[PDB]
Design a protein around this motif. Structure first.
Motif, short mmCIF file in Angstrom:
data_model
loop_
_atom_site.label_atom_id
_atom_site.label_comp_id
_atom_site.label_asym_id
_atom_site.label_seq_id
_atom_site.Cartn_x
_atom_site.Cartn_y
_atom_site.Cartn_z
N UNK A 241 0.83 -1.20 0.00
CA UNK A 241 0.00 0.00 0.00
C UNK A 241 0.85 1.23 0.00
N UNK A 242 1.89 1.26 0.84
CA UNK A 242 2.81 2.38 0.88
C UNK A 242 3.62 2.56 -0.38
N UNK A 243 4.02 1.45 -1.01
CA UNK A 243 4.64 1.46 -2.35
C UNK A 243 3.72 2.00 -3.42
N UNK A 244 2.43 1.67 -3.34
CA UNK A 244 1.45 2.13 -4.35
C UNK A 244 1.22 3.65 -4.30
N UNK A 245 1.52 4.28 -3.15
CA UNK A 245 1.43 5.74 -3.00
C UNK A 245 2.59 6.48 -3.71
N UNK A 246 3.70 5.77 -4.01
CA UNK A 246 4.83 6.32 -4.74
C UNK A 246 4.63 6.04 -6.25
N UNK A 247 4.02 6.97 -6.97
CA UNK A 247 3.73 6.74 -8.41
C UNK A 247 5.03 6.87 -9.26
N UNK A 248 5.99 7.66 -8.77
CA UNK A 248 7.22 7.87 -9.56
C UNK A 248 7.95 6.55 -9.71
N UNK A 249 8.20 6.10 -10.96
CA UNK A 249 8.76 4.78 -11.25
C UNK A 249 10.18 4.59 -10.74
#
Ligand SMILES: CC(C)Nc1cc(-c2c[nH]c(C(=O)N[C@H](CO)c3cccc(Cl)c3)c2)c(Cl)cn1
Length: 340
Positions: A241-249
């Motif tokens: 979930x916390x990874x999904x908040x970081x949209x920058x690839x």
């Protein structure tokens, strides 16, 4: 002639005499002095920013903020000294309440009782509530910017990196350079944040609380991306979930490239700490800045119950909304302290 100290003109007389060195910064120096009008020793901060746009900007922001703010846990400005004219003005001197020590010095030499930690943390957050209520971010909270008197009353100093909050323009790319002190930088700085949200300060307070518990910085990185290594080494790998908040690839893929790391239990790092203190620590040192505790929630946390009183935790009345032009504004902003 003018008084000198560490081979450096300290041009503050006749009002201010009997000078001793206190400390320094990137574009100036702090002394103690005797105030002949108020008959007390004071701190005097000499600032020489006029050759650099950036230092002018920081000087102006700090003066403007400290002149507006009035709070027991925030250092004030009692006086400003500078030459009568722009051209004679090489330096600005800011006169402030003299303090006994700072939390950096204290942590090098002194075990803090849990009652001291509790009280210091309460005062930090009480000051920060006011700062954040004014739509301002301090952006460089660390032990050396927390001042103490002989009875352990605490004041936040150094607003040189402070900015008006701007959460709608917080996003940036991976590994974007950042100005504030490395050990107290929130993980998102290294990933996708400009440090324009209030959550940046909460992270720094979390690091300060950890350091009060052990007398050692919790995340002492040696360089820009090593700071993040240290953070994840204790927090463990971010959640899906916390990874999904970081949209920058680039930022996301960097995190996905790392082996799994387990969370280190707070009570393993700090086995003698109060369990309520560790519960608040956990909440301030949350990876995801949106889930991180806010200042007013921190104040309301069970650890601080002996001190919590929102009616005695004031907010700001009036929140906030090249280099040559910046200099005139410093001249203008300091005019109210001159004779005449
Ligand atoms: C004995 C000490 C703790 N007493 C004391 C210290 C200060 C004080 C401690 N620090 C600063 C401060 O503003 N330092 C920044 C660097 O953080 C800086 C200094 C010079 C130039 C630049 Cl550009 C920036 C003021 C006060 Cl106000 C009262 N009593």
């Amino acid at each position: 002639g003018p008084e000198m100290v560490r081979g450096q003109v300290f041009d503050v007389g006749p009002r201010y005499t009997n000078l001793s060195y206190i400390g320094e910064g990137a574009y100036g120096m702090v002394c103690s002095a005797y105030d002949n009008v108020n008959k007390v020793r004071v701190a005097i901060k000499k600032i020489s920013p006029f050759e650099h746009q950036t230092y002018c900007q920081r000087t102006l922001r700090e003066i403007k903020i400290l002149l507006r703010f009035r709070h027991e846990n925030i250092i004030g400005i009692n006086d400003i000294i500078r030459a009568p004219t722009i051209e004679q003005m090489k330096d600005v001197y800011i006169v402030q309440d003299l303090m006994e020590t700072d939390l950096y010095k204290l942590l090098k030499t002194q075990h803090l009782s849990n009652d001291h930690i509790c009280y210091f943390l309460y005062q930090i957050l009480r000051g920060l509530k006011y700062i954040h209520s004014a739509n301002v971010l301090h952006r460089d909270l660390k032990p050396s910017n927390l001042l103490l008197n002989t009875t352990c009353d605490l004041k936040i100093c150094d607003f040189g990196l402070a900015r008006v909050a701007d959460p709608d323009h917080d996003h940036t790319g991976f590994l974007t350079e950042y100005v504030a002190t490395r050990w107290y930088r929130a993980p998102e700085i290294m990933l996708n944040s400009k440090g324009y949200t209030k959550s940046i300060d909460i992270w720094s307070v979390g690091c300060i609380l950890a350091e009060m518990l052990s007398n050692r910085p919790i995340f002492p990185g040696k360089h820009y991306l090593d700071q993040l290594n240290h953070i994840l080494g204790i927090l463990g790998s971010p959640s899906q979930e916390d990874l999904n908040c970081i949209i920058n690839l680039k930022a996301r893929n960097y995190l996905l490239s790392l082996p799994h790391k387990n969370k280190v239990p707070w009570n393993r790092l700090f086995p003698n700490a109060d369990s309520k203190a560790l519960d608040l620590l956990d909440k301030m040192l949350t990876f995801n800045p949106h889930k991180r505790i806010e200042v007013e929630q921190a104040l309301a946390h069970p650890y601080l119950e002996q001190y919590y009183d929102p009616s005695d935790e004031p907010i700001a009345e009036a929140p906030f909304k090249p280099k040559e032009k910046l200099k005139e504004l410093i001249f203008e902003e300091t005019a109210r302290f001159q004779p005449g």
